[PDB]
Each structure stands twice: as structure tokens, then as C-alpha cells.
Design a binder for this molecule. Sequence first.
Ligand SMILES: CC(=O)N[C@@H]1[C@@H](O[C@@H]2O[C@H](CO)[C@H](O)[C@H](O)[C@H]2O[C@@H]2O[C@@H](C)[C@@H](O)[C@@H](O)[C@@H]2O)[C@H](O)[C@@H](CO)O[C@H]1O
Ligand SMILES: CC(=O)N[C@@H]1[C@@H](O[C@@H]2O[C@H](CO)[C@H](O)[C@H](O)[C@H]2O[C@@H]2O[C@@H](C)[C@@H](O)[C@@H](O)[C@@H]2O)[C@H](O)[C@@H](CO)O[C@H]1O
Ligand SMILES: CC(=O)N[C@@H]1[C@@H](O[C@@H]2O[C@H](CO)[C@H](O)[C@H](O)[C@H]2O[C@@H]2O[C@@H](C)[C@@H](O)[C@@H](O)[C@@H]2O)[C@H](O)[C@@H](CO)O[C@H]1O
Ligand SMILES: CC(=O)N[C@@H]1[C@@H](O[C@@H]2O[C@H](CO)[C@H](O)[C@H](O)[C@H]2O[C@@H]2O[C@@H](C)[C@@H](O)[C@@H](O)[C@@H]2O)[C@H](O)[C@@H](CO)O[C@H]1O
Ligand SMILES: CC(=O)N[C@@H]1[C@@H](O[C@@H]2O[C@H](CO)[C@H](O)[C@H](O)[C@H]2O[C@@H]2O[C@@H](C)[C@@H](O)[C@@H](O)[C@@H]2O)[C@H](O)[C@@H](CO)O[C@H]1O
Ligand SMILES: CC(=O)N[C@@H]1[C@@H](O[C@@H]2O[C@H](CO)[C@H](O)[C@H](O)[C@H]2O[C@@H]2O[C@@H](C)[C@@H](O)[C@@H](O)[C@@H]2O)[C@H](O)[C@@H](CO)O[C@H]1O
Lengths: 126, 126, 126, 126, 126, 126
Amino acid sequence: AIFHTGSELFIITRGPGKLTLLTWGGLNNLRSVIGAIPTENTGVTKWAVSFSHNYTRFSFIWEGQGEACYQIGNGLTRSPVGRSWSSSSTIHWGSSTVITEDVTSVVPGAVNRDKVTTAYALPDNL
Amino acid sequence: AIFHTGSELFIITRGPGKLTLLTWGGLNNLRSVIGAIPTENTGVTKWAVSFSHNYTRFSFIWEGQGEACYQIGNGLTRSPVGRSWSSSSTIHWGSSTVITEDVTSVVPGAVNRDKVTTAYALPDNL
Amino acid sequence: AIFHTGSELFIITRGPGKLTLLTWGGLNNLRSVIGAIPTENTGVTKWAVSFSHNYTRFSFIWEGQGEACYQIGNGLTRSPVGRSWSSSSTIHWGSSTVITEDVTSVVPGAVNRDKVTTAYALPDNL
Amino acid sequence: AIFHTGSELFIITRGPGKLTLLTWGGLNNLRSVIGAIPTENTGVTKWAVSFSHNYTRFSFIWEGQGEACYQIGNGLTRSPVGRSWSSSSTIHWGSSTVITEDVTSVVPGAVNRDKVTTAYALPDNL
Amino acid sequence: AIFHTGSELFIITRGPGKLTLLTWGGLNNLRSVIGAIPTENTGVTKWAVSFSHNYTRFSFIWEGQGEACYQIGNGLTRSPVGRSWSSSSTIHWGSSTVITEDVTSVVPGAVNRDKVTTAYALPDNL
Amino acid sequence: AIFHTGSELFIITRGPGKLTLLTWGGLNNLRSVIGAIPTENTGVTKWAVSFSHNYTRFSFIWEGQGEACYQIGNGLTRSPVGRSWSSSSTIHWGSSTVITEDVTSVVPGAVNRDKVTTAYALPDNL
Ligand SMILES: CC(=O)N[C@@H]1[C@@H](O[C@@H]2O[C@H](CO)[C@H](O)[C@H](O)[C@H]2O[C@@H]2O[C@@H](C)[C@@H](O)[C@@H](O)[C@@H]2O)[C@H](O)[C@@H](CO)O[C@H]1O
Ligand SMILES: CC(=O)N[C@@H]1[C@@H](O[C@@H]2O[C@H](CO)[C@H](O)[C@H](O)[C@H]2O[C@@H]2O[C@@H](C)[C@@H](O)[C@@H](O)[C@@H]2O)[C@H](O)[C@@H](CO)O[C@H]1O
Ligand SMILES: CC(=O)N[C@@H]1[C@@H](O[C@@H]2O[C@H](CO)[C@H](O)[C@H](O)[C@H]2O[C@@H]2O[C@@H](C)[C@@H](O)[C@@H](O)[C@@H]2O)[C@H](O)[C@@H](CO)O[C@H]1O
Ligand SMILES: CC(=O)N[C@@H]1[C@@H](O[C@@H]2O[C@H](CO)[C@H](O)[C@H](O)[C@H]2O[C@@H]2O[C@@H](C)[C@@H](O)[C@@H](O)[C@@H]2O)[C@H](O)[C@@H](CO)O[C@H]1O
Ligand SMILES: CC(=O)N[C@@H]1[C@@H](O[C@@H]2O[C@H](CO)[C@H](O)[C@H](O)[C@H]2O[C@@H]2O[C@@H](C)[C@@H](O)[C@@H](O)[C@@H]2O)[C@H](O)[C@@H](CO)O[C@H]1O
Ligand SMILES: CC(=O)N[C@@H]1[C@@H](O[C@@H]2O[C@H](CO)[C@H](O)[C@H](O)[C@H]2O[C@@H]2O[C@@H](C)[C@@H](O)[C@@H](O)[C@@H]2O)[C@H](O)[C@@H](CO)O[C@H]1O
């Protein structure tokens, strides 16, 4: 299952843009969260994308002119990230698969946590 | 503040061991989570450590013979991680610094999520 | 077009095994060539795969038990390599796409050039 | 012998320029090929240089202001590349050594395949 | 002891600046040496700092806008370097720690060997 | 001149062994120094070799089954290190080149400083 040790969610992007994570499907009516994380890098950025406990749905898109792909754990495959919410990259908690899913109706209701959500660009010096 | 874009929490470790994350201070009686994340690497492991929405305390320790340090964003400083829950590395949500705190009172009530919490070892091919 | 500058063919594998290249569709009555290139690496091996002048078809498989993917140029996507001749990774000269093609009818006529064909594992010190 | 598994031909260059490969000594009257491959990198470029089946001579030069060296396999030695066709770097099929050779008599006959010959710059994300 | 095998002195800096080394406490009235080593790198520079035989004191500072840290051997800790001679990073021969020492009284007697002392920036291609 | 900024002395080795430095040609009646620096590494080790102030001769050998080469600054060329004191790699202070020199006559009178001379293996975390 994605997010377990060995099945971590990594993203690789090229050039500048924003990776946005939608955290939703909250247990016990917990509020959905949406936050955009910018990169100004000209080249490749590597990213770690985390879940939050007590949520069952994680959806993400890339907004940038360059490519963006996800990798599961140390798997070799790198597959394109969704580029709009009607064809978002989505994980159902417990799934081993990223699917394409329309989450356009979830986005406006989510609390805005731009630059403070669970997706992180790795620096030059790690 | 740590966990904001630019102040991401990275850990570097040497040799095999377990990084354990205690997620606590949950809003509205959300249950605390404890999970250990193993590595078997003989050398260096790099890690990205995430928060979870709706929690306000994040405590971590390293259990291994080899060193463990944290780095904030692309800062050059690397400082040691705590090695037991009585001297845990702890972050209070909104703080810009890691402190040393005894969280032994929080551990017994935490639900075990070994290999499925918000700390991730970076693989060899990222 | 694959094999042109900017669209070089790279392979990424995990663990030991043989990458086997079938060079075929030769002009000027040229004999097809088949050659297996071994790696003994436990971890990730990166590879550069070249065409040969005067041939119009290039087909390859990974015979190892670990994962294998190809990357075109500095593209981010990495997609699985074929694992049998009936589902080979195949390039038609001039195409920008690696297709899946059955080349079992070509293999028996090819001259064996094991360890001496146009696929190369990159070393640890490049 | 160079181009066999273990004795792969790699180039290292600094700054922008063209690596040009002459493929000649074609069996059965096969047409010699010349093709220049550009790099615009300001720093180091690593390259993989392939042979073509049915040819028995491979000559290459670097036209760039910066340095250029070849490495055989995982050998540590890096030695300078020829900088003109009268002092080309040349491999005789079956040889274990790159020698200096004057191939100006071969170049005029060769068909131009610029940006489409068997020498490849490795990208930033391999 | 620092400068023994396993306890090599490395520095990590960000951005352009100069690292200066004061070699002093020479036996047999050997003259003290001071030399500044510049970098123009915009990003992270890694440095190896050597002692000289027959000296008992080694002091160093970083002059630059960006951060500077030292690391001992393959240890994970990175700690700040001194930024003026009144607060120098200093090693007493045989000591396992870097101390803060005011060596303003030593600096005038030293011979200037800018760009020719025993601290070295590591290049892009090592 | 070797050892000036831009012309730093680096070594690359494969497999386990020892790099030995002989510091001689001392001014001010200084005794010659010899010291072996071992590595246990199975793969490639990178090294920084420093001079000592007040000496004019620096001679080094690699004793190991595996290859060993030197590189000057960020130059691309890598050339073999001497494998015995009768064929040492030698630098005359002020020279821009490494020569071969027999220094067997210096060795017996040199003070032994094994694991404590000015040649350093670079670690995995730099
Ligand atoms: C183990 C796990 O992931 N369980 C998921 C279920 O979530 C747990 O449900 C029980 C109630 O039966 C408790 O509410 C528990 O707190 C829930 O776990 C918490 O939330 C999940 C989503 C994880 O983040 C977990 O680490 C956290 O402790 C869930 O109800 C079902 C269906 O959605 O999925 C289970 O996999
Ligand atoms: C913006 C933020 O991080 N706020 C923190 C407070 O948490 C929010 O509290 C409000 C009510 O005042 C709501 O309960 C809101 O849902 C809370 O935010 C959620 O939980 C926090 C911890 C973050 O994970 C956030 O992204 C998430 O939406 C919090 O009560 C106090 C505790 O000191 O800190 C505030 O910084
Ligand atoms: C430029 C090119 O790639 N052309 C391909 C054609 O191959 C050439 O065909 C001509 C006659 O039409 C000659 O036979 C020439 O030698 C051929 O080029 C040689 O072979 C090709 C496959 C490449 O390796 C090239 O570099 C080499 O010189 C080919 O016949 C057609 C049909 O397949 O494809 C053309 O793209
Ligand atoms: C095995 C090999 O490399 N052989 C070289 C000879 O080339 C082969 O010659 C035979 C005739 O004896 C056939 O014509 C065969 O198709 C030739 O092999 C082809 O060309 C060589 C150059 C390689 O690319 C090979 O993979 C390809 O199948 C060759 O005539 C002589 C000349 O130097 O060298 C032999 O090593
Ligand atoms: C082993 C060592 O570091 N010795 C230090 C002493 O220095 C040596 O002193 C003896 C006389 O007792 C000789 O003069 C000898 O040459 C000195 O060693 C030389 O200088 C030292 C600092 C090192 O660079 C060494 O490699 C070099 O050969 C020193 O006198 C005392 C007190 O400061 O410390 C000893 O550690
Ligand atoms: C600047 C330099 O490297 N000079 C070398 C000369 O060394 C200096 O010689 C004078 C007397 O003429 C003093 O003895 C002085 O202390 C010497 O400099 C010291 O030693 C040299 C080897 C360097 O380590 C230097 O940094 C240190 O201060 C040397 O006499 C001549 C001839 O060998 O070469 C000069 O390049």
C-alpha cells in the first residue's frame, strides 16, 4: 500500500511550478486541506509527499510547464502526475495504485494551507 | 516555522536502525500515533519527516549504533537527534527549533502504526 | 525520433540480469544480430542503448528478475521494458515511441553477439 | 577489446562543443558515416560512444574550447580525446587501445548524420 | 584527534566567500602562515582542510554572506565556523574538538600565502 | 603550480589499500615525514592530498591490487599513481606537473606518521 515503508510517494519535476496536495476523506468529519508548494528550481526537483493520519484520500496535481512524474518507493517506474483536478492523481488509503480521479467538487471546501502542507521539495545539500 | 516550505525537516543517519515518530497533541481527542520506520542501510540514509494535519506535537528518536542528525531546509547545520523518549527531539507546532523533551508519559496511550507513519527513508534511485 | 540527440535511449534496472538487444530490419541484405549484455550489480544499473547504422528495427528485453524501465532523453517518465520476445520493447527507425512488438520470428535467424552488442552499462565512476 | 562488456567507451567533456564520430571500414562496401553531436552544457558532460555492427573502424574528435577525455569501462584512467581529424582518437575493431590516427582521407566520403549517430550525452536525471 | 585518519577536517559553505587558514605554534621558530582561499560558487562548496607538519595550532575563519559549517571525518554533525580572528575556529594539535580562540595577536607575524595554503575546495568532477 | 588554488591534488582509487605520502625537501633542517593512509573501501575512494608548509618535495604511492590515478584541480585527465618508492609520483614545489622519482634513499630516515599525515580519504557524506 502506498505510504507504507517501501512504498513511499516521491515526485520528480522539471522547472518551476507548484505541487498542490488535497488531503480529504477525513475520519469523523475532519476538514479537508489544500496547499500549494512552490519550486523556483530551473532543473529537476525531487519531492517527498506524505499523508496525514486520520485521512483516507490524497489527491495532487502539478501546475508548471515542465514534466512531473511520481515514483513509488525505490520502484523504477515514473508515471505522469495529474495536471488538473478533473484528472487529479489520487490515492485511496490502503491502495497500492495512483488513479486518475475528478476531485473538483472537494477543492473549494478545503482549508487553504499554502506552503504548510505535507509535501516537501528536497534541497541541494541533503 | 519548521514544516513550512523552506524549513522542511530532514534527518541523516548512519547504519541500520529505526527512526520512530510520535505524533501527539491532537486536536479534538485525536489519538496519538507512534510508528517505527526501519532502515537496513550500512551507510548513510537520508529521511524526510512530515507532520500530520490537526496535530500539534511531533517527537522523534533514533535507535541505532550510528549517528543521527537533523537538518532544517537547506541550512548547513546538522544537529543530533534524541536517542530515547526521555530526551526526544520534539517540535511544538509553529516553532522554528527542535527541543529536547521527555514524552515517556505520551507513549503508552499512542496507537502503534510501525512502518506506516509520516517519516520516510529516501531510496537509492531518487 | 528516438536515438536522435535529445531523445537518447536509456534503461534503468534493479539487480543482476541480461539486457538483450535484437538489431534487425537491416538494409543491403544485412544479417540481424542478437546479443545479451549481463550486469552483476545488486542495485540500480543505468544503461545507454544505441542503434547501429543501416538497421531499421531495434528490439530489446530484460531477462533479469528485477524491474527494468526506459527513459527517453532527459524526460522524467520511466516505463517498463519488455520481458519476452513476444512482448519486446521495439523501436521502428524514425519513431518517437517504444512499442510492444512480437519479434519471435526474427530471433532464430540472428547471429549471436553476446557481450558485444550496442547496449552498455554505465560504471560507478562516471 | 573496446566495446565489449567491461570495456565500454565513455567520454567526459567540459563546456559546450561537438563530439563527432566517424564510423568507417564498413564490411561489403557499407557507406562510412560522420555525425556531430552537440552539448550546450557549461560544465561537465558524460557521454556513451557506441560502435555500429558491420563496421571495423571508429574515430572521434572533440571540437570545443574545453577539455575532453575518454575512459574505458570502470577504468580510472582518463586520457585526452583527439581535437582534429588528422589526430583523431581511433579504435580498430578488436583492439583494447584507443590510438591516434589521421582519418582526413576517410571524412570526405562519409554520409552526414549530424545529431543522429551512435554517441550520446547523458542527461542530468540519469 | 582531528586530522588523524577517521577525523579529517571538512568544511561546507554556501555562496561565495573566502576561507582563511592560520598555521601557527610552529616548532623551531617556523614562521606562522596565513592564506585566504576564495570560492565564487553560488551554491554549496565542500572543502578539505589539512594541517602542516611541525605546527601545533590551526585556526580558520569564513568571510562570506552565507553559512559555513565544519564536519569531522564521516561524522554527521555540522557546526558553525568562526567569522573573525577574535572568534576563530581553532584546533590545538592532538585535540579531538574545534574551540573558539582569539588569535588576533598571531595574525600580524604571519607570512601571507593567499591561494597557496592547506585548504582546498573540492571540484564538480571528483 | 600544483597545490595552488585551482590546481589542488586529488587521487581516485579502487578497492582497499594504502596511500603513502613522503613529505621531504624540508627547509630549516626539517626531518622528512612518511605516513600511510589506509582505506577498507571495496569501491572507489576519492582523496585530497595536501602539502605541508616549509617542504619542497612531495612523493606518494598507492599499494593495493586496484588502480589509482591523480587529477589536478577540476581537470578531466586522470593519470596513474606510482606503485613503489623507486617509481613514486613526485611533485617538486612550484611545478605544474607530477613526475616519477626514485625516493627510496629518503624513506628509511623519514619519521613514521602513519594515519596522521596530510592525505585524506573523502567520506560518503560530503
Ligand atoms: C490502520 C488503518 O489505517 N486503519 C484505517 C481506518 O482508520 C482507523 O479506524 C479506527 C476505527 O475503526 C480508528 O478510528 C483509527 O483511529 C483509524 O486510524 C487512523 O486513521 C487512519 C486513516 C490512519 O491514518 C491511521 O494511522 C490513523 O491511526 C479506517 O476507518 C478504514 C476505512 O477508512 O481504513 C483503515 O485502513
Ligand atoms: C493554521 C494553523 O496551523 N493553526 C494552528 C491551530 O490549528 C487550527 O485551529 C483551528 C481553530 O482555531 C482549527 O481547529 C483548524 O482546523 C486547526 O488547523 C488544523 O490543525 C493545525 C494543527 C494544522 O495541522 C492545520 O493545517 C490544520 O488545518 C492550532 O490549534 C494551534 C495550536 O497552538 O496552532 C495554530 O498554529
Ligand atoms: C537518413 C536515414 O536515416 N534514412 C533512412 C533510410 O536509410 C537510408 O536509405 C538510403 C537509400 O534510400 C541509403 O541506403 C542509406 O545508406 C540509408 O541510411 C543508412 O541506414 C539508415 C537506417 C540509418 O542508419 C543511416 O544513418 C544510414 O546511413 C531508410 O532506408 C528509410 C527506410 O527505412 O528510413 C530512412 O529514415
Ligand atoms: C565476430 C566479429 O566481430 N567478427 C569480425 C568480422 O566480421 C564478421 O565477418 C563475418 C565474415 O567472416 C560475417 O560477415 C559477420 O557478419 C561479420 O560480423 C559483423 O561485423 C562485425 C564487424 C561485427 O560488427 C559483428 O558483430 C557483425 O556481426 C570482421 O570481418 C573482422 C574484420 O576486422 O573482425 C572480426 O572480429
Ligand atoms: C607525534 C607528534 O605529533 N608529536 C608532537 C610533538 O612534535 C614532535 O616533537 C618531537 C620532539 O619531541 C620532534 O621535534 C618531532 O619532529 C615533532 O613532530 C613533528 O611536529 C608535530 C607537531 C607533528 O606535525 C609531527 O607530524 C611532526 O613530525 C610536539 O613537540 C608535542 C608538544 O606540542 O606534541 C606532540 O604531539
Ligand atoms: C613562497 C614560496 O613558496 N617560496 C618558496 C621558498 O620557500 C620560502 O623560502 C624562504 C627563504 O628563501 C623562507 O625559508 C620561507 O619560509 C619559505 O617559505 C615557506 O616554505 C615554502 C616551501 C612554502 O611552504 C611557503 O608557504 C612557506 O612559507 C623556497 O625556498 C623556494 C626554493 O625551494 O621555493 C619557493 O617557491
